Structures are given as C-alpha cells and as structure tokens.
Design a protein around this ligand. Structure first.
Ligand SMILES: Nc1ncnc2c1ncn2[C@@H]1O[C@H](COP(=O)(O)OP(=O)(O)O)[C@@H](O)[C@H]1O
Ligand SMILES: [Mg+2]
Length: 813
C-alpha cells in the first residue's frame, strides 16, 4: 500500500483535533497557559506519556508561538511536527517553516526531563535558531541551551527578565485579539509585546548547556563532545547526559553529506626529535639478552630486571614503571625495538633520507606511509636523519554511528525523498513528504546542455545580464570558489554589480535575504552559501516572475541541485529555475557526453547554442540517479567496515566508563589476573602440552620472582592455574596494604592510560588493514568477511596486551 498516504491521512485527523483545542486555549490568560505547561511537565515522563498528551502539548506550543513571536504554526507545520515526534524524516520544502515546525515535537519530548538535541549544520544556524525560537521555549518554562565552537556554550535568557513577567503577569501578546488570519502583519503587531519577549545569549559552561531542557548545536559539536567525553580521567568531566531525542535539521546535509568523513580528534607530535635521537643511542648500550630479551615469535622486545635498572640509573628515575615516567618507558621500547627488531632492508630502506619498505615486494614502495605508534620516528632516529612530525588520533567515530546512539532519532529537510533508501538503511527512518502550505508554482525549466564550458559560462552571463536588465533578481549556484571567482570576473568585465558568497555564515545570511529577493539583485552562491536563510521577494519582483535560480552545473546528486532549486518558489511564490550543463562537465564526463554529443550533432544544432528537451532533461535525471547508485553502494561497503570497528569501540568505551565509575577493582583485577594465567596455561600446559620452560619465558615481563616454579610438583593443570594466580593475587593484596587507599586512583589512572594507548595504536594499525582489504579483496570475499575476521584477530591481541600491561603495572609501582 501507499505509506505516505496512510501516514498523512492519520496526521490530518490529528491536526484537526489540535484545531478544536485552539478555541479553548486562545482565550486563556498568559498565566493560565504557563500553569498548563507545568501540569504537562509532570504528566509527561516517558514516550508512552508523550503520545497521550501530544494533542494538548502541540496546541499549547502553537499559542505560545502566536503570542511570543507573532507566528501561528500552519497545519502543515503541525503536520511536520508530528512526523518528527514519530522518529521520521519530515520532508518539508525549504522556506516551509521547519524551524517553527520543530518547536512542537521538541517541547513535547523535552518534558521527559532527559533533554532534547537539535542539530544543525553550523554555528549561526545553531545560535540563530535558538534565539529565534527561544521565547516560546522560555515562555513555557523551558531552559534553552546552545553549543558552538570553539569553547562556546550559551543559555537563551529573557533580554529584560523584569519585562517578560509584566507581559506574562499581564496578558500581553504580539498577535492582537480578534485577528483571525493565518498570518499577522509586521505592520500591525504590539511592539509593546515584541520588545517584552526579546531574548539574548548568556555564556554558560558546556556541561550546563546539556542540562537544559533542550540543546541547540552543530552536528560537529555534539559528536566532538562525545569523543572528548571519552578522554576524561574523571567521570565528572563529562559534558553530556546520554543521548535521548535528537532532531537533525538539514537531515540530508548532516546525515548523508557531512557524514562521509568520520569525526576525528587529531593532535600534533607530542615528543621532540631531540628525545628520539637521545634514545637512539641510549638503546645502543643495552646488552641484548642481559638487560632485556627479544622474542620476535614474532614480535616484541621485553626488558629484564637488569635493564629496568640500567635505565633507571641511566635516565635516571626512581621508578621506571611509574605513572609519571611512562612516556620515558614507552620511548625506550620504541628505540630499543627499532634497531633490535626491524634490522635494515628488513624491510625498510633509507633512501634520500626517507625510510620506506616491504610490502612483500608489491613492492617496498609503501610511500606509502609510516609505522604506527611513533616507531617510524624511532627508526629515522636510528638511521641518522631525519625525524618527521607525526599526528596522533585520540578518538574517531562516524556520524551515522553517533546519531545511532540516540533513543529517538528524527530529521527534517526539503530534500529527503529521493534518498529514502539511505535514511532507512542507515538510520532506520522513513521519509514523510509533508505537503506545501500554499500551492507550488515555481517554473522549473528543462536543462540547457552546451558543447563546451566556455559556451556554458558565456551563455550563463548573458542570462544574468538579460535578467538583470529586466529587474528580475538572480541567485547563481556554483560548486567551487574557483567557479564563483570566474563568474565574478565575467560579470564585472560587462560591468554588472553583484555579490559573491562562500563561507562566513553570520554575515552572508545577512545579505542573502535582502539580496536575492530585492529588485535587480544578482547573487553568486558557492556550495549552498546562505543556506537556511529564507529569501523574501522584494516589491515588484513577483510580477517579474520572482527570483531566478541558475545552476552552473548539475551535481553528482540530484539532492544538491533541488537544494538550490527549492530556494525560489516559497509559499506559493513565483520563481524560476534553470540548469546549465556542458559535455565537458564532470557529471557528463562521467556519463553520456558522447551519447548526448552525437544527438546534438545529428539534430539541426549545434550552433554554439544549447539543446533543450524534456526527454533530455529526463535523461540527465536518470543518469544522475545512476551515478548516485554507484556512490551509495560504494559508500555502504565503507559503512559496514566502519560498523565492524564501531562495535569494538563501544566495548572499549563501555569498559572505560566502568573503570571510571568503579571504586573497588578487586573483581576486575581477578578477571585480568586470571586471563593472564589462563591463556598461558591453556596453550603451554594443557591437552598434549606440558612445556614449562616456555611458560615462565612468556610470563617473564613480571618482576622476578613470582618465579618459584622450578620446585615443580604439579599433579594437574588446574593446580598450576590456581597456583600461578595465587602468587599474583597475593602480591596485589600485599600491595593493597602499603600504598593504602590512594591505590584505587593509581590503578584507575594506569588502566585508562594503557587502554587509551592501545586503542589509539590499534586504530592506526586498523587503517592499514582497512585499505589492505579494500584494494586487495578482489575477486572477492565480500570485503567485510575478510575485514571482520582480520580485525578480530588484531583486537584480540590488543586485549591480551592490555591485560599483561595492566597486570604488570599495578604490581610494579
Ligand atoms: N508560522 C509562520 N507564520 C508566519 N511566517 C512564518 C511561519 N513560519 C515561517 N515563517 C516565515 O518563513 C521564514 C522562515 O522559514 P524557515 O523556518 O527558515 O524555513 P525552513 O525551516 O523550511 O528552512 C521566516 O522569514 C518567517 O517570517
Ligand atoms: Mg531550516
């Protein structure tokens, strides 16, 4: 059946019922309305409870909006609101009222007391939307938070707290009593009340911005907060309170487009080359097999008791294995290993002062990149010259995997339907195409395809001239600054005044509004500049045919084109739209230039002119649609792999969180201590095996001696396990005794260190394998199976190394 019809049919009924309420509430006094919000706040405490009072809630919001901003939400805006509350992507054409529309569901689900996240694309839109919708929220007793870069969090407050109360106390409104239109007039609204409900920004802390009933921010910042939140050493330095309900504004932009590059926290090379080189020779003095042992089984180097001492005396620090000197320790291992374990031409080469190697000879030209963990820098230090800046990665996550954390996800755009597949396969969200408020009368012309770019751009500038002379305003869309700068040359060599836009949003939206709509105004916008800022038509301009959209080229995704296009018709406004193409454009270059090119020659054309026909326009659509196909498939494979990683990341973070919150590590240590002994017992001394020389060889990292193994009188493997563990756990207790109660903290710190360390090194390593599988999977274990299985082995090793590193640190300190 038709989902969009059934769903919509239901919404209609609902919106209808919300209308009957209005007559009950429009009569109420400002204090009565606030009292109702209070009753609702205590009545609505879960999702079940939210749908119960959704009628009352949505209606109340409407009124507060009619009295607070002068805007009375349209039926459609109430429709979209519901589609948000239901965890779907409400497709509402641009200039429809999404901002306001979102206010109703936001308010409703915000009464649960777990917070509500509104994500946009940038700072402006985050800050702007807040201040713009703030009064309504404040009026109903909600605290509105806002999160921007760099270290910026604010709280929308009344501009004149005293003045707002007069307006509530007394029954002030912006919308005069008795007006019964769908739209108030800027000319006729009680300025006494507009000025009363003015809102401004108040600098607050990050943590607090989230403790607000709702939180407005950028997709970037919400995610960054989460990653940072997993770099803490105190569960109290977190600035988030879980992930409850998030409405993603500009869904297609955040959840698909901005979402293809994974969110990263990159830093700079911590240590200096001076120290590497200083360790490059500190490492030439450690006598192999005395101060340490290498068992590249392969492949690690592990010190002995003579080596910990040399270094300690040498460095010289009281304790090598202590919380402060781990950097030192760590540095020593890289330098000690580099030349004692990578040799020379096995398989790296120093040619031209650059080290490069292997890869089993496909060939050694992996330049390709440097080794993980700062080992590479250690090699150059060894070879003589010279060390290069490295960039460490502390945390990563993709947007898909992030917004997936939220209990209820929701989004809204004017461009969602064409990509329903994606919202459903990635975020599990349906698209509900909300009808427009007023009829949509914008004339979308068939595309103009030219032979050559020169001809494309030359005939584009004729259009600008031709429409400018007429008085009709023009918004020209480009895809690079390069292309925007070029147009600007052309335009001014024929003396045509105009505005160019790219990326400083607070300012650009400022003119985008006055500029596109106002008579005889030309504006060039790069990459959807002035996004989200509504363009109102100027006086006399509607008769001219309204704003005229020019696409300098079609994008690889019809979405992006419909984003520029939707900018013109508006609320049944008149507007025009045309896309220029050339057989040399990338999209065309990618597909059908020649198939088109020939039809061009065959027909009476081409004169230096363009070919235009519905069937061609339609052809471009299919071709452009097919180019999206191949992308999404490609992209989805990457996604699957990203997910495979994400699952590990969760386990780690979830653990990190527990370590953060555990005051007693008695049980956790037992789990580590046992896994330390169990694995070494089950492989060396079990089934057909009873090799001990090798057992204590593997456990040699610990301080000799818990090494009282040579008095061997083991009857069975269970005795050995239980025993090995004993001397381990006894030591732990013997050590709980002296450090006293400051020990829980010391451990905690060490655990986080080790786990972060290994996590960051793991990720670096994993990347190589990601690419390894990607390129070499052909032809072809579904790349995921290779990756899932290979990534597994690696993670399993990481857990082993973490345990040994943890078990070993708590005992030596
Ligand atoms: N309910 C309403 N009543 C009157 N005007 C509205 C209403 N909703 C939106 N507008 C007008 O539309 C413009 C805002 O559109 P916007 O909410 O930014 O669209 P979208 O959210 O689809 O991008 C504003 O200039 C505002 O004057
Ligand atoms: Mg918007």
């Amino acid at each position: 059946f038709d989902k969009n019809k059934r769903i919509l049919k239901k919404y209609a009924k609902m919106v209808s019922k919300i209308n009957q309420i209005e007559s009950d509430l429009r009569s109420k006094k400002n204090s009565e309305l606030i009292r109702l919000s209070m009753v609702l706040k205590e009545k609505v405490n879960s999702f079940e409870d939210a749908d119960e009072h959704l009628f009352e809630a949505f209606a109340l919001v409407r009124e507060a909006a009619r009295r607070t901003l002068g805007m009375r939400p349209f039926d459609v805006q109430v429709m979209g609101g519901i589609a948000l509350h239901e965890g779907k992507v409400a497709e509402m054409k641009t200039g429809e009222g999404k901002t306001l529309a979102a206010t109703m569901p936001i308010y409703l689900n915000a009464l649960i007391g777990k917070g509500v996240h509104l994500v946009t694309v940038n700072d402006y839109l985050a800050r702007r939307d807040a201040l713009w919708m703030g009064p309504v929220y404040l009026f109903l007793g909600l605290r509105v938070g806002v999160i921007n870069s760099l270290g910026k969090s604010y709280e929308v407050v009344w501009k004149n707290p005293d003045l707002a109360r007069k307006a509530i106390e007394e029954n002030w409104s912006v919308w005069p009593d008795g007006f019964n239109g769908e739209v108030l007039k800027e000319e006729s609204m009680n300025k006494e009340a507009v000025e009363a409900f003015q809102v401004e920004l108040k600098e607050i802390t990050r943590k607090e911005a989230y403790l607000c009933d709702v939180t407005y921010g950028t997709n970037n910042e919400f995610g960054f907060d989460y990653l940072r939140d997993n770099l803490v050493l105190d569960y109290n330095d977190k600035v988030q309170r879980g992930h409850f309900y998030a409405i993603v504004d500009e869904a297609d932009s955040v959840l698909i487009d901005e979402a293809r590059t994974p969110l990263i926290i990159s830093g700079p090379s911590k240590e200096s080359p001076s120290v590497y080189r200083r360790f490059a020779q500190i490492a030439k003095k450690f006598v192999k097999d005395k101060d340490f042992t290498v068992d590249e089984k392969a492949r690690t180097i592990i010190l002995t008791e003579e080596g910990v001492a040399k270094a300690e005396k040498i460095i010289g620090v009281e304790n090598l294995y202590d919380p402060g000197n781990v950097s030192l320790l760590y540095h020593l291992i890289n330098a000690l290993k580099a030349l004692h374990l990578f040799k020379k031409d096995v398989d790296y080469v120093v040619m031209n002062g650059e080290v490069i190697i292997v890869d089993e000879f496909t060939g050694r030209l992996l330049p390709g990149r440097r080794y993980s963990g700062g080992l590479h820098q250690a090699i150059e230090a060894k070879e003589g010259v010279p060390i290069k800046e490295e960039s460490i990665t502390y945390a990563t996550i993709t947007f898909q995997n992030y917004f997936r954390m939220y209990e209820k996800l929701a989004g809204m755009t004017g461009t969602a339907k064409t990509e329903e597949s994606e919202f459903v396969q990635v975020y599990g969200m349906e698209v509900v195409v909300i009808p427009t408020h007023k009829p949509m009368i914008r004339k979308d012309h068939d595309d103009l395809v030219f032979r050559t770019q020169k001809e494309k751009y030359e005939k584009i500038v004729e259009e600008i001239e031709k429409r400018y002379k007429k008085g009709q305003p023009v918004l020209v869309g480009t895809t690079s600054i390069e292309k925007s700068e070029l147009l600007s040359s052309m335009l001014k060599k024929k003396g045509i005044p105009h505005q160019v836009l790219n990326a400083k949003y607070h300012e650009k939206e400022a003119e985008i509004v006055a500029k596109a709509g106002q008579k005889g105004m030309v504006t060039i916008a790069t990459n959807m500049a002035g996004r989200g800022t509504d363009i109102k038509l100027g006086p006399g301009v509607a008769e001219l045919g309204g704003l005229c959209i020019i696409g300098t080229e079609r994008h690889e995704s019809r979405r992006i084109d419909n984003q520029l296009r939707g900018r013109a018709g508006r609320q049944g406004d008149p507007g025009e739209s045309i896309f220029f193409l050339s057989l040399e454009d990338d999209l065309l270059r990618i597909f059908g230039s020649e198939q088109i090119g020939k039809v061009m020659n065959i027909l009476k054309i081409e004169e230096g002119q363009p070919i235009q026909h519905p069937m061609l326009s339609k052809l471009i659509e299919n071709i452009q649609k097919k180019v999206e196909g191949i992308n999404f498939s490609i992209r989805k494979t990457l996604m699957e792999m990203d997910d495979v990683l994400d699952k590990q990341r969760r386990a780690v973070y979830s653990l990190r969180d527990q370590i953060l919150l555990e005051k007693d590590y008695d049980e956790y240590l037992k789990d580590i201590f046992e896994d330390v002994v169990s694995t070494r017992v089950e492989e060396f001394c079990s089934g057909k095996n009873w090799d001990i020389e090798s057992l204590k060889n593997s456990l040699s990292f610990f301080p000799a001696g818990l090494f009282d193994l040579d008095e061997k009188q083991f009857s069975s493997s269970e005795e050995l396990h239980d025993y090995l563990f004993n001397r381990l756990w006894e030591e732990y207790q013997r050590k709980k005794q002296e450090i006293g109660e400051d020990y829980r903290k010391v451990i905690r710190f060490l655990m986080l260190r080790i786990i972060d360390d290994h996590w960051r090194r793991y990720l670096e390593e994993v990347e190589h394998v990601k690419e390894a599988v990607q390129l070499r999977s052909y032809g072809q274990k579904d790349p995921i199976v290779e990756f899932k299985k290979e990534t597994y082995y690696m993670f399993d090793e990481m857990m082993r190394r973490i345990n040994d590193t943890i078990a070993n640190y708590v005992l030596r300190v």
